[PDB]
Design a protein around this nucleic acid. Structure first.
Ligand code: FES
Lengths: 55, 234, 19, 145, 58, 51, 184, 49, 49, 79, 401
RNA sequence: AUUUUACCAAUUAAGAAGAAUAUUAUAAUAAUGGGUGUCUUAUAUUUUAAAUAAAUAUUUAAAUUCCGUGUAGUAAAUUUAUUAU
RNA sequence: UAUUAUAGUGUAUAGUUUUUUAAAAAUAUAGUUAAAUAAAGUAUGAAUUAAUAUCAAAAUUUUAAUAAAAAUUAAAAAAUUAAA
């Protein structure tokens, strides 16, 4: 709140690592063997088969 | 020539002249020396290269990532000429001329303008057609002849508009390199006509059911009538 | 916001009573 | 056309006349005035300004494209004298008809001196409500003393 | 509240004409009877019943 | 307008009455009348048709 | 009205109307013939600054992976991009392009309409909050040479859980004879 | 690993486009009537609003 | 007061970021650069060379 | 570079990922109702259940712990 | 106090004394109405401030004036509709011309040449579809034209269709008029063959749903028993590839039931049996699949498809002892293994953070927030906070509701 | 077996009546307070007074006076006149 | 659509029904002597401020008043949070 910033001063944040981790991340996924939908490991559906066996 | 009209482009654009602009240029993107503030040295080959290559990719040119268009394809070039002739001469006027010299002054001037536009388009597309002769197709060559007929321009097989070269003393014509100018337009068009006739003959020789029988019959009848109209045989 | 939420809830209850 | 005195005062243009288009899309093409829109100062001439007229589909019929002559600005066309068969300036004139012996207004061609009457308008007359229509005789019955 | 206890104000310029005065015995005693309008139609007649609201077209 | 475009019928008067005053005529007293005006400044009464 | 065009080294006059109509027709037909579908979503409910980040994330990906990432993300920009990708995929299907070879060839946004909302403040002050919107351009081209990673692989935990359940780790692929019209 | 990103000078500084004096385009009579979008390279097979 | 507004806006393309984007900043920087280069040429360049 | 191939990241499930490695030896009996398996997330012979790192028959010396024989993996298991 | 411009569109802060203003909740900006103000426009009928004057003259012109038609014109338009037979003939002619003039793909070496886009074929395709009541897949047409053999097998069929229609035969129209019985005619057979070729192109492309739809339209057109059997077999295969097991099974059963009406030379019956068995296998009923394969073998001993499927089922049976039984009836369909299923999951799958049961819930035809979902009174549901409307207590619990 | 380093770039041609019975001065002829969706009732709807004022004056002298705050009939009903969708 | 029942009269069992979130600092509440509540992140999105080149580690010396102004010497990485 004291002086205007220039494009490079603004781009310092994208240079940093926190910005990349917060915005520029790619999720690893696979097709669920049961519902054949995109799925991230550790998260499942509420379907009975998914609950009983968790892909 | 990069950012402006190129090889087969129809739009005429003088890159140095700031036409088609609503603003007086204040910033010159391609600048090599601070002296170019008052001595841009535009027109010189190297500085003009810098400026033109700094210009962004317009609709004619395409960026390195955008997918370009096969403008050098004969199957696209021929329908372009057909569309040019169709736009120049309306269907009603074409039918009237085919049925029929009693024409209105407006219609006569429309026909003359169409012939002039078709000649200009052929001049612009000539290098691409010449490059695409080799891998063309019989249907597209027949379409070339049909488009010429529709435009009403009789090709110089040796009214007529290609036979007469455009006026202008040889000492004033634009001979600058890098611009696709065809000074020997009638000779080049005659060579192209001979080449396409030979290509049609070769395609028919290579080609040599009810559907295919009818296709062959109609193709032969077309070829015959179109070549007769244009003053060609075989 | 902590005490403000409770204050707003009490105000809403009073408004419902008075409506 | 909502502006006051937007119409043309003399209003020489009436249906059934022959006019030629002097400006616009079609120039030199002449025809008969199919219809006239006086409050817009527009004319509809056969085979002059033909444009498609789309019709949105309904529950009983699908979409259908139909072509009808569209209105043309009055100033674009000029009258054609039948005798001369050329473009002729027209002006409103008044004559006392011999038959009725009463004044009436026609339109005269200056170049050739031709007179053209005003085609009377007779809209559809097949309509009527006999149940609630007073008979003409009883309506005309005079009982006022 | 009397004569206004709501949202839509009354329009005194279209109120029915005053015709009397209150009295606790009967209610509203009517004094100016001529104020009240009676829509007496004309008596029936031949031409009257032959007439119709619209006029035919020649 | 749409009905005319479809049916081809001609219209001789505006389908709706237009009040160009938007109530100014109502505000003006009924007996209003513009005054006479002599020796007015305008070549319109001349009737020229060539200049 | 005539237009000057350089022909045979000299300027030649051609009908200006025909010249312009021919130019526009050629541009439009060339763009249509280009083997790609371009879609424009206007008034996107997302500030262009924020949406640009998700656009950069999704940029340069195949359609399959772009859709997967947008569905697996928790961002307004990613949801908007998923909607845009769905619309562009439908457009490509209608245009005839091959779905399995689709790829994103351009994703960008520029500022669009902007509504303003009043935010009261103490001491009698006030301002106008800005409700921003963006214009999203999404181009789906075709890359026949494109080869996609094999995402059917699943964790060993899932494999052995399915084995315990009795399912088969491999898919039950059954040969499907191609359709034929011999009987006709 | 990470997606390339670059802050846009277009977002940093976006001055309004020049207005028209007397609603006049200076080179309307000199330029073709072609769509500036087409001649600049912006095209859309399906515009959605 | 005259400043090389039109003459320096032309080469304003040779700067970076804010100076290249905003007319005033670029013009001020170019004016300062021209003056400093003139001073250096007229009082130190010959000595160094 | 005209147009580099798609950015689609290669399959990375079978590589080593610390977030998933944190669950290899984590008790998970409540998670499962009817299909329980012994050390579900643990793949014998692999570093923290990463099939891309195989130590089954390489000779790593673990005198007090068991190991399993090397059965060559398959494409549908690796990726 | 005052820092920016006096207008409401100015950004920076203002004060009541200097620049007093009215309470404008939300109004457009300098660049035109935004999505939020337009949502207000469409819902409330005017901008939320209320100081704006609604003006939808352009919308009225677009909708009501365009759809208005007088009674007489509406009555005579149907009578003046174009001639269906001539319009269909013209559509077929132009479609065939466009297909014939469609350029052939150049067989490049070292990479795959991009197939030229089909711009001029869409309008002929659209009119042909409108006339015949069928829907052709643009992807299928593109694949058919790209393939050389399929291109010829499509062109010949189209030419035969044109010839038979020009000869005065319109089998669908004649059948409809008569209904308002006989066997399939040459024109109808040619149309069926054309649709089958389009479906084959769709299958080659990978658009199994389009292939199935085209084959369903062909089945609708056809009336011959042999054509019905062949089309049912094709639809069963298309549905199997598209992951529509119920449809595949139904079509296979219909083909196997039509078996008797077909001559021995045809293989449509065997194809239908194979499709039914494959549908059962995908539904994970190995006993049913084996029984169906046994019946198919008993019917047509020696069929290559039946032998291949029997061998595959034998391999699966040899693998089964590892499980000691078949897949338990509890799941019986859980596992998904088709690329069509994967594509469907990618498209219509419930994404994380949106398009799920917690983002929006679709009521009969309307979108609702998860809290208003009438399918569950979960802890985040408004229905939970209601109770004891006045009739009766209705619940034993005495803490809420 | 595996893989394309980090950083750095730029605004321009505008799609359609989304600009005219428009903005300002200008008419020396009208004029009882203009008020439409108005629409009885008049003890209750009264503004007048010899002055610099909606009426507005062609020059430098002399002259009272502790900074001279200043100039006459031009024609007598003669045309310098408060105009106007 | 805000701290907030406008209470005149008047009455006492109508459940008269909208307040996110998986830690920490700081801040507010909360058996010596004279432990609770407020997170990041998803989403929305202000305000004071703004001469400024991609910036001003540090020390020494000096110039006309704080002097990151000058010179010498020296060696100052990027992002995030907190700290006057
Ligand atoms: S089927 Fe994929 S998460 Fe259950």
């Amino acid at each position: 709140p004291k002086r205007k910033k220039n494009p490079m001063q603004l781009r310092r944040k994208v240079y940093g690592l926190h910005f990349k981790e917060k915005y520029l991340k790619m999720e690893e996924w696979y097709y669920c063997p049961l519902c054949a939908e995109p799925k991230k490991p550790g998260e499942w559906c509420r379907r009975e088969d998914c609950r009983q066996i968790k892909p | 020539v990069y950012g402006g009209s190129g090889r087969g482009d129809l739009l005429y654009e003088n890159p140095d002249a700031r036409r088609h602009s609503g603003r007086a240029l204040g910033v010159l993107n391609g600048v090599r020396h601070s002296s170019q503030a008052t001595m841009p040295e535009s027109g010189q080959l190297y500085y003009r290269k810098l400026i033109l290559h700094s210009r962004p990719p317009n609709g004619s040119c395409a960026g390195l990532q955008r997918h370009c268009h096969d403008t050098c394809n004969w199957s696209y070039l021929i329908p372009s000429l057909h569309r040019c002739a169709e736009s120049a001469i309306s269907a009603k006027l074409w039918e009237k001329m085919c049925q029929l010299v009693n024409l209105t002054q407006y219609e006569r001037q429309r026909v003359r303008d169409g012939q002039n536009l078709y000649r200009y388009e052929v001049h612009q597309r000539l290098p691409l057609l010449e490059e695409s002769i080799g891998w063309a197709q019989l249907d597209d060559l027949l379409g070339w002849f049909r488009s010429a007929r529709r435009a009403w321009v009789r090709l110089p097989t040796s009214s007529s508009a290609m036979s007469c070269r455009l006026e202008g003393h040889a000492d004033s014509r634009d001979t600058t390199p890098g611009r696709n100018q065809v000074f020997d337009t009638p000779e080049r068009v005659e060579q192209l006509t001979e080449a396409t006739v030979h290509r049609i003959r070769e395609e028919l020789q290579r080609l040599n059911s009810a559907r295919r029988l009818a296709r062959d019959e109609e193709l032969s009848r077309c070829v015959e009538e179109e070549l007769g109209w244009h003053g060609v045989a075989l | 916001a902590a005490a403000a939420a409770a204050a707003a809830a009490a105000a809403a209850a009073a408004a419902a009573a008075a409506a | 056309y909502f502006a006051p005195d937007f119409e043309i005062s003399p209003w020489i243009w009436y249906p059934g006349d022959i006019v030629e288009v002097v400006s616009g899309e079609g120039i030199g093409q002449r025809g008969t005035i199919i219809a006239v829109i006086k409050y817009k100062n527009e004319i509809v001439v056969q085979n002059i300004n033909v444009q498609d007229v789309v019709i949105p589909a309904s529950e009983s019929r699908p979409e259908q494209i139909v072509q009808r002559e569209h209105p043309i600005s009055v100033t674009r066309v000029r009258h054609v004298d039948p005798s001369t068969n050329e473009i002729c300036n027209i002006e409103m004139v008044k004559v006392r008809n011999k038959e009725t012996g009463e004044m009436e207004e026609k339109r005269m061609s200056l170049e050739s001196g031709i007179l053209m009457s005003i085609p009377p308008v007779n809209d559809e007359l097949e309509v009527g409500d006999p149940l609630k229509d007073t008979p003409i005789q009883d309506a005309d019955e005079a009982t006022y003393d | 509240k009397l004569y206004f206890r709501g949202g839509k104000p009354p329009n005194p310029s279209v109120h029915p004409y005053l015709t009397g005065e209150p009295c606790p015995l009967y209610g509203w005693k009517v004094t100016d009877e001529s104020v009240i309008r009676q829509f007496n139609m004309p008596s029936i007649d031949g031409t009257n019943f032959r007439y119709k609201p619209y006029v035919a077209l020649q | 307008d749409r009905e005319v475009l479809l049916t081809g019928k001609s219209v001789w008067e505006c389908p709706i009455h237009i009040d160009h005053t938007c109530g100014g005529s109502k505000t003006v007293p009924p007996h209003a009348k513009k005054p006479v005006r002599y020796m007015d400044a305008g070549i319109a009464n001349v009737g020229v048709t060539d200049i | 009205r005539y237009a000057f065009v350089e022909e045979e080294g000299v300027m030649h006059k051609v009908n200006w109307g025909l010249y312009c109509e021919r130019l526009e027709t050629e541009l439009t037909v060339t763009q249509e013939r280009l083997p790609q579908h371009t879609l424009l979503m206007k008034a996107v409910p997302s500030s262009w600054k924020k949406l640009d980040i998700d656009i950069s994330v999704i940029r340069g990906l195949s359609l399959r992976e772009a859709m997967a990432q947008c569905k697996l993300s928790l961002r307004k920009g990613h949801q908007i991009v998923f909607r845009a990708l769905e619309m562009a995929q439908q457009g490509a299907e209608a245009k005839g392009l091959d779905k399995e070879h689709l790829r994103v060839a351009h994703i960008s946004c520029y500022p669009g309409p902007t509504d303003k909302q009043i935010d009261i403040r103490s001491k009698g002050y006030y301002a106008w909050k800005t409700k921003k919107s963006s214009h999203l351009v999404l181009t789906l081209a075709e890359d026949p040479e494109m080869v996609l990673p094999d995402r059917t692989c699943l964790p060993y935990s899932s494999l052995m859980s399915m084995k315990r359940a009795g399912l088969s780790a491999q898919p039950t692929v059954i040969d499907v004879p191609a359709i034929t019209a011999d009987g006709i | 690993m990470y997606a390339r990103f670059t802050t846009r000078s277009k977002f940093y500084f976006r001055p309004a486009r020049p207005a028209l004096a007397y609603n006049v385009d200076p080179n309307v009579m000199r330029r073709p009537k072609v769509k500036r979008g087409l001649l600049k390279g912006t095209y859309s097979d399906e515009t959605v609003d | 007061h005259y400043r090389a507004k039109l003459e320096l806006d032309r080469i304003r393309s040779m700067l970076r970021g804010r100076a290249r984007l905003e007319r005033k900043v670029g013009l001020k920087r170019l004016f300062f650069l021209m003056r400093t280069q003139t001073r250096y040429r007229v009082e130190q360049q010959a000595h160094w060379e | 570079r005209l147009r580099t191939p798609v950015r689609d990241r290669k399959c990375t499930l079978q590589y080593y990922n610390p977030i998933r490695a944190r669950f290899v030896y984590r008790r998970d009996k409540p998670l499962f109702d009817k299909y329980h398996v012994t050390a579900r997330n643990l793949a014998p012979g692999f570093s923290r259940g990463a099939l891309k790192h195989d130590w089954r028959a390489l000779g790593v010396y673990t005198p007090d712990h068991p190991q399993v024989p090397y059965h060559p993996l398959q494409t549908w298991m690796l990726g | 106090y005052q820092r920016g411009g006096w207008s409401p569109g100015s950004k920076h802060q203002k004060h009541m004394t200097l620049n007093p203003t009215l309470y404008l909740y939300r109004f457009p900006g300098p660049h035109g109405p935004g999505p939020y103000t337009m949502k207000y426009w469409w819902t409330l009928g005017c901008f939320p401030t209320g100081m704006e004057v609604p003006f939808r003259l352009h919308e009225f012109l677009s909708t009501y004036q365009q759809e208005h038609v007088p009674v007489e014109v509406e009555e005579w338009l149907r009578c003046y509709i174009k001639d269906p037979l001539s319009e269909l003939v013209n559509a077929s002619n132009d479609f065939f011309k466009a297909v014939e003039v469609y350029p052939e793909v150049e067989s490049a070496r070292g990479y795959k040449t991009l197939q030229p886009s089909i711009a001029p074929l869409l309008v002929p395709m659209k009119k042909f579809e409108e006339q015949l009541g069928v829907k052709i897949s643009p992807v299928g047409l593109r694949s058919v034209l790209s393939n050389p053999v399929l291109k010829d097998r499509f062109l010949d069929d189209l030419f035969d269709y044109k010839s038979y229609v020009e000869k005065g035969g319109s089998t669908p129209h004649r059948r409809l008029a008569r209904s308002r019985a006989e066997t399939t005619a040459d024109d109808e057979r040619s149309l069926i063959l054309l649709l089958t070729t389009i479906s084959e192109g769709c299958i080659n492309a990978g658009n199994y749903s389009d292939a199935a739809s085209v084959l369903a339209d062909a089945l609708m057109f056809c009336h011959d028993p042999d054509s019905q059997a062949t089309t049912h077999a094709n639809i069963s295969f298309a549905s199997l590839l598209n992951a529509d097991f119920k449809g595949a099974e139904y079509n296979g059963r219909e083909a196997a039931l039509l078996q008797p009406q077909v001559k021995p030379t045809s293989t449509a019956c065997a194809r239908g049996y194979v499709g039914w068995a494959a549908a059962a296998a995908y539904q994970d009923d190995f006993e049913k699949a084996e029984a169906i394969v046994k019946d198919g073998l008993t019917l047509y001993v020696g069929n290559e498809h039946l032998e291949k499927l029997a061998n595959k089922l034998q391999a699966l049976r040899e693998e089964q002892p590892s499980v000691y039984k078949q897949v338990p009836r509890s799941l019986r369909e859980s596992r998904s293994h088709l690329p069509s299923q994967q594509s469907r999951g990618l498209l219509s799958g419930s994404g994380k953070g949106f398009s799920n049961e917690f983002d929006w819930v679709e009521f009969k035809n309307k979108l609702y927030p998860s809290k208003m979902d009438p399918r569950n009174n979960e802890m985040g549901s408004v229905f939970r906070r209601v109770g004891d409307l006045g009739s009766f207590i209705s619940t034993s619990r005495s803490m809420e509701r």
